Amino acid sequence: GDQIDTYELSGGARINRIFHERFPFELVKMEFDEKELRREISYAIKNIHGIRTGLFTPDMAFETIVKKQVKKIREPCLKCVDMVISELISTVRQCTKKLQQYPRLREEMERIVTTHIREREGRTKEQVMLLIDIELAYMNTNHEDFIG
């Protein structure tokens, strides 16, 4: 549509593209000490070879480190979802409270919309969990790993 706010703001749900370009920041806010990674790998190897003498590096020493690293990203995804919900609520308020002079109507039309939004919060979080859970279920080395 027309009548865009060319001067005053960067706004009107274009903030959500910042979350989609801000979540790539949360995914790298996390850091680890390499010495703990090395210690954990050493113990993973020593714990995979239980009594046997090792000839080749076991493949579970890779898988059990990757799963442990992958479990860390559950939190920032939920933070992203909550931020998106916050922006939807703010947008509904702008489209409801500022343009309507009738009492009671601007309450029903905000309450109903934000209730529907919260229910979709529920469904969205379930789908995010069923995506990260899938990332753990299988290790795929076919597409872009360091091919020998």
Binding site: N47, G50, I51, P103, E107, R111, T114, T115, E119, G122
Partner: protein, 339 residues
């Protein structure tokens, strides 16, 4: 009967969890000798508040109600003391007031924190604030009015807080300070509820029909009229039951209020507040439902064995034995081989 929101509060207490309902703070703002402090007494249902003509509410009182199976009160400044006779709670409030403000009609912004436990109360926060005045007396400083407003603004300018504007009936409504404050902080009327507290003392020949019908100063949520206990009745320790019966008789008899009789009095105010709170938690429930369902999903898979538990069940014992022996053999093999 108990309203459904109290049924939820009972169930949440009954499950020993920290999940709870998010309810607004309720502030009652009036004016000097308006009677605001006497309204909370009837709302809560226990005659523990200090009362009487003059400067009686000197410090803001923060009263928190908690749902519990034992009825009692506690103070933060009286640690470990379980009060069961509220007529000593009154004395502790007066003593704590005098300890800080002094006896010469002083005030202080520091609140008194009281917690009351009872079986069918929500987790509401109630604030009894000192009334506004124009003329300083009793060594109060010349700016007493501004300090009182400064105390009020820290409770009535917050969001998610209801404002009950208490105005007397015998004093012309245009002079009411509570309506001025509510108007300043709630221009739209979404949060303000008005109450007319002294219809008993109207000058003979007049009435307040033009106020209770929301015509003289239209307010979005209307006005509720009440009749409270007079100074003599409190000095005579008249039972709350008699006061409520007298109020009902007053409204039924008075020729100018019969058609409003079913919208007035303390219990109607209770119904209105319950409806406002009930409509305040809508659009919050989906989160509680999702958390409760998640816990049920994580318990239901296990409690199936418990529901049919019997002290004599050889099949349950046999299968438990087989599963534990299997788990032992597998755990030992994994632990020593490393597989």
């Amino acid at each position: 009967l108990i309203p459904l929101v109290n049924r939820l509060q009972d169930a949440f207490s009954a499950i020993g969890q920290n999940a709870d309902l998010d309810l607004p703070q309720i502030a009652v703002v009036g004016g000097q000798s308006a009677g605001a402090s006497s309204v909370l007494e009837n709302f809560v249902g226990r005659d523990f508040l200090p009362r009487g003509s003059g400067i009686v509410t000197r410090r803001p009182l923060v009263l928190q109600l908690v749902n519990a199976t034992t009825e009692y009160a506690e103070f933060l400044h009286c640690k470990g003391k379980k009060f069961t006779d509220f007529e000593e709670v009154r004395l502790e409030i007066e003593a704590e007031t005098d300890r800080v403000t002094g006896t010469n009609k002083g005030i202080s912004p520091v609140p008194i924190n009281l917690r009351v436990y009872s079986p069918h109360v929500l987790n509401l926060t109630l604030v009894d604030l000192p009334g506004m005045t124009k003329v300083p007396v009793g060594d109060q400083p010349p700016d007493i009015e501004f300090q009182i407003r400064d105390m009020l603004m820290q409770f009535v300018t917050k969001e998610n807080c209801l404002i009950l504007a208490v105005s007397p009936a015998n004093s012309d409504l245009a002079n009411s300070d509570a309506l001025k404050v509510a108007k300043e902080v709630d221009p739209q009327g979404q949060r303000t509820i008005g109450v007319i507290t002294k219809l008993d003392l109207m000058d003979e020949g007049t009435d307040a029909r033009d106020v209770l019908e929301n015509k003289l100063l239209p307010l979005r949520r209307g006005y509720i009229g009440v009749v409270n206990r007079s100074q003599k009745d409190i000095d005579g320790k008249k039972d709350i039951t008699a006061a409520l019966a007298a109020e009902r008789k007053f409204f039924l008899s008075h020729p100018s209020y019969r058609h409003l009789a079913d919208r007035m009095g303390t219990p109607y105010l209770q119904k209105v507040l319950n409806q406002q709170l009930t409509n305040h938690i809508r659009d919050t429930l989906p989160g509680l439902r999702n958390k409760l369902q998640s816990q049920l999903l994580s318990i239901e898979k296990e409690v199936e064995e418990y529901k049919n538990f019997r002290p004599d069940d050889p099949a349950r014992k046999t299968k438990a034995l087989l599963q534990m022996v299997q788990q032992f053999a597998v755990d030992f093999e994994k632990r020593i081989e490393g597989s």
